[PDB]
Write a protein that binds this ligand. Sequence first.
Ligand SMILES: O=C(O)Cc1c(-c2ccccc2)c2cc(Cl)ccc2[nH]c1=O
Ligand SMILES: O=C(O)Cc1c(-c2ccccc2)c2cc(Cl)ccc2[nH]c1=O
Ligand SMILES: [Ca+2]
Ligand SMILES: [Ca+2]
Ligand SMILES: [Cl-]
Ligand SMILES: [Cl-]
Lengths: 144, 144
Amino acid sequence: DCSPGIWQLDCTHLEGKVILVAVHVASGYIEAEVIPAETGQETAYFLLKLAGRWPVKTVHTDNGSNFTSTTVKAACWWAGIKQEFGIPYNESMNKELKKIIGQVRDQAEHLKTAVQMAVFIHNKKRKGYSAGERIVDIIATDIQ
Amino acid sequence: DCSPGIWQLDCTHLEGKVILVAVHVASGYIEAEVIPAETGQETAYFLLKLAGRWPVKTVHTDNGSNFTSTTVKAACWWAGIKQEFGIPYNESMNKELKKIIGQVRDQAEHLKTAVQMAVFIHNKKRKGYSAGERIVDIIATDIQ
Ligand SMILES: O=C(O)Cc1c(-c2ccccc2)c2cc(Cl)ccc2[nH]c1=O
Ligand SMILES: O=C(O)Cc1c(-c2ccccc2)c2cc(Cl)ccc2[nH]c1=O
Ligand SMILES: [Ca+2]
Ligand SMILES: [Ca+2]
Ligand SMILES: [Cl-]
Ligand SMILES: [Cl-]
């Protein structure tokens, strides 16, 4: 998709741990972190954090049951976030992010550190704007 | 100050808990969260997260000893962050953010939720651009 308010939110597993990945669809910009466990509390918290930082209008996921908890629904309600239905189920940021995580894995002891390093590398890499430059360009243009 | 790479990073205390607050100096845009405890590990982790999301060149703090830990220094080294020395010690986002936190405190059980709600309110409030609009404007203009 390409609307500037659309985000994709999924969890991946690595080293018996859970990584929450949010992708700004229009830009490829990512935010991610290791979460203690795959729960509605964690997801709702991540969403509130995301919505305070970017203009999040709609969120899609590849696992719809991710968004059934009362806590998630309350976070989306409070922040004014809707579920995206204009993206069908049939990218692979998860493999690409895991590729980068594997590249920097030894640069840190804890996976959570490695994940942030990978996010940094992903968002700054030019290919020629970076995802980080693209998101601010897309959002700033959408204001004016 | 007004350079687009300058951030201010402090901790506040509330309800026997610790809130890490990062302020984009040029825009007034904030990121914050409740951290388990006031440690170098927590600060370094916050900094890596921040640097992967925004172009962080320099960081100032009101408590210089915040940045003495080996872990913090390594995070700044890795991300290419320098300590800001162009801002002297003699804003009050901490009182203003605590004001908003107190306004929404009952809207959530856990302080960490309240804090994100306050960040959201702060960043979206027009006064007439919002801090959230100002930061993307400042950063996007600084690319082109
Ligand atoms: O390895 C981790 O997961 C973070 C970490 C780092 C570190 C911080 C930034 C980049 C890479 C590693 C660290 C670094 C030093 Cl010089 C000493 C203790 C340290 N202790 C830690 O826990
Ligand atoms: O109160 C918290 O700190 C978060 C939270 C919320 C909540 C989520 C977003 C905004 C406000 C509160 C919640 C909401 C419902 Cl409808 C049910 C269980 C819930 N349980 C929780 O832990
Ligand atoms: Ca319930
Ligand atoms: Ca040491
Ligand atoms: Cl280490
Ligand atoms: Cl509650």
